A paper describes a structure:
The bacterial enzyme [name] ([name]; E.C. 5.1.1.1) uses a covalently-bound pyridoxal 5"-phosphate (PLP) cofactor to catalyze the racemization of L-alanine and D-alanine, the latter being an essential component of the peptidoglycan layer in bacterial cell walls. The lack of [name] function in eukaryotes makes this enzyme an attractive target for antimicrobial drug development. In all of these structures, [name] is a homodimeric enzyme formed by a head-to-tail association of two monomers. The active site in each monomer is located in the centre of the α/β barrel and contains a pyridoxal phosphate (PLP) co-factor covalently connected to a lysine residue by an internal aldimine bond.
Here we report the crystal structure of [name] from [name] (AlrSP). Crystals diffracted to a resolution of 2.0 Å and belong to the space group P3121 with the unit cell parameters a = b = 119.97 Å, c = 118.10 Å, α = β = 90° and γ = 120°. AlrSP forms a homodimer in which the two monomers form a head-to-tail association, typical of that seen in other alanine racemases. Each monomer has an eight-stranded α/β barrel domain (residues 1-238) and an extended β-strand domain (residues 239-367). The pyridoxal phosphate (PLP) cofactor is connected to Lys40 through an internal aldimine bond and resides inside the α/β barrel domain. This planar density resembled a carboxylated aromatic ring, therefore a benzoic acid molecule, which fitted and refined well, was modeled into this region, even though the compound was not added to purification or crystallization conditions (topology and parameters obtained from the Hetero-compound Information Centre-Uppsala, HIC-UP). We observed electron density consistent with a carbamylated lysine at the NZ terminus of Lys129, as seen in most other [name] structures. The smallest constriction in the entryway corridor of AlrSP is between Tyr263' and Tyr352 of the inner layer, which provide an opening width of only about 2.6Å for an active site inhibitor to pass through (the distance between the closest atoms of these two side chains with the van der Waals radius for each atom subtracted).
Author numbering:
A (entry chain B), B (entry chain A): 1 to 367
């Protein structure tokens, strides 16, 4: 989808909030700890380039999900280290050396495919991924790690770091987290040589298991001011939500009792009422399950009535308003606020998904 | 999100399927009927520019949701008429006039605001929207419409068309559909001068209510080979889905009973089994509610086990397969097929939203 600047629907991104969030996390981790800003998925829908430029001088490096996301940052002028967190294609070892990226290595088969293809590996920097119980990617046994470490170093790869990832750091129970931490430590303890940069901590590990931090933290959701646990756990200190989502009224009508709104005619006015149309819909990532959720107009909750269309929603207003009146979908308006977490809860999902699905059709504006 | 060509996740768009679907619709409507290709929301996530260029010679116009989508078509050299379906901003009308876009006009308040800005509207082409029971945008009263048509003509605006839209053309029951149709016809009958180009028919109306077609059809879902009713109604003739979604294995392991996958550790292997990782996740629009749905690998259904991550899913394979083995998420694979309708039903949504949410991180390739 192409950014639509001539439509009044927009996402506002408070870059200072992101900076402040990084500061508050910094104030609460040990002194030498490296801060890696996770800006995968276009900085969780906030804008990877604009966010990276705003905060570069405050972090030690970036993390992205794939090499194309890293390339995007390099082309824009970002100069700090970038770690690609997932598996890369064989056809991208050469690029890492040319753009100066660090790659994650997670399995023997992958290394053996790279060796078979006979690519030169000499300049390459990598981190080894350990699967300590997330079951997603990484070496699962100590012997596998060392065999991989031996084989990489001998083809001249620099094995710089080693990391794992936690599945349950954002839950009340700490049993699964503890089991993973111990697995990871035992695997590190059995290596004859441990890579110099060891890291395991996502946002939730940083916020609730601060005493378990290794040499770096990978800051995601918290950087954007989002509670990684959603509504489950209280933050140990305040985070400011970076992203706000707004639009305006483009049609306002009074309808008599009996009038139906939307596909399926699933909503029927029981009395005379004011119905307004707002130019956002599911192609913008305001999904169909937002029906009956409220937006804010002039400090008041207005329900989305009838089905969400591809490009438009109809809402019920408490009275007549002019064309162009501001609609707040995420953010504050009057004395009321809607958070991305509140949106995720309504949809039965997590705030990560809400912000990522905000489509590129909505322009991002920065302040 | 930026297209990631160095990752093996891609959407294949068969332009020949789209061509055949338009031809198929043409064969089942009167020979004189104009066909307008609806390519809002980046052609429902299929690629508005590439789809528009592929089919331009076979259609009489394009429909988009806003001026910026219209500009994107023009800047790529499309020359056919472009109708903007939703309300346009007042500040954007001068730009629209320079590009010869056809704008939708839906309310008197809007027209008044436009005239208050003293911008020259001479030669602007518009269509009037009639709300006949969609309750979204458009004139609801016969006299509202003629006041509008009069005000516009007095300022040199050319009123070329008039349209309405149906809320329930894709349902078994025809009651609401018929009331809308009669309301529309009653409106048109009450005007002293009906604009030349009358249209009302979306995909569902075109498919299931052929006898109701006016001068033109607006082809949406059916053009992409998608059943507008999902699984509710049988198609009157064959449609070929245009979009296939595929990826590849990037990690493969065998885990014993007891091993857990994904965030929250919500899936625990109850037997030794093969688990592979595929680089697609909810930031690509493969949403978290896809957990426990299956993808296809080597003609076999393989469930998504554990939570969907932002960039990755883990699936259970029936035996070992090498890295790079193709995964089909939407499309055919061996003797099996997964449709966007099946995906939609699983999520409790409609196929429109499935394809619209496939983010731009997925490159489109055109066949």
């Amino acid at each position: 989808m192409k950014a639509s600047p001539h439509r009044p629907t927009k996402a506002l991104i408070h870059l200072g909030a992101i900076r402040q969030n990084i500061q508050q996390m910094g104030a609460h981790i040990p002194q030498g700890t490296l801060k890696l800003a996770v800006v995968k998925a276009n900085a969780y829908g906030h804008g990877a380039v604009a966010v990276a430029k705003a905060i570069q001088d405050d972090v030690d490096g970036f993390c992205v999900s794939n090499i194309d996301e890293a390339i995007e940052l390099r082309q824009a002028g970002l100069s700090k280290p970038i770690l690609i967190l997932g598996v890369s294609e064989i056809e991208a070892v050469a690029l890492a050396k040319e753009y100066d990226f660090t790659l994650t290595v997670a399995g023997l088969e992958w290394i053996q495919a790279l060796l078979d293809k006979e690519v030169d590996l000499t300049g390459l920097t990598v981190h080894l991924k350990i699967d300590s119980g997330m079951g997603r990617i990484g070496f699962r046994e100590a012997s596998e790690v060392e065999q991989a470490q031996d084989l990489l170093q001998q083809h001249g790869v620099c094995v710089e770091g080693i990391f794992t990832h936690f599945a349950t750091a954002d839950e009340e129970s700490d049993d699964y987290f503890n089991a993973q931490l111990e697995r990871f430590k035992t695997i590190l303890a059995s290596m004859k040589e441990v890579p110099e940069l060891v890291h395991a901590s996502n946002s939730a590990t940083t916020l609730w298991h601060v005493e378990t931090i290794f040499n770096a933290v990978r800051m995601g959701d918290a950087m954007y001011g989002l509670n990684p646990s959603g509504a489950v756990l209280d933050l140990p200190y305040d985070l400011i939500p970076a992203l706000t989502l707004e639009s305006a009224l483009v049609h306002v009508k009074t309808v008599p009792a009996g009038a139906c709104m939307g596909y399926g005619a699933t909503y029927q006015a029981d009395s005379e009422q004011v119905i307004a149309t707002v130019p956002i819909g599911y192609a913008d990532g305001w999904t169909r399950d937002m029906q009956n959720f409220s937006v804010l107009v002039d400090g008041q909750a207005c329900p989305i009535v009838g089905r969400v269309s591809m490009d438009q929603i109809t809402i019920r207003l408490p009275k007549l308003y002019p064309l162009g009146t501001k609609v707040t979908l995420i953010g504050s308006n009057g004395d009321k606020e809607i958070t991305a977490t509140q949106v995720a809860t309504y949809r039965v999902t997590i705030n990560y998904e809400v912000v990522c699905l905000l489509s590129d059709r909505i322009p991002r504006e920065y302040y």
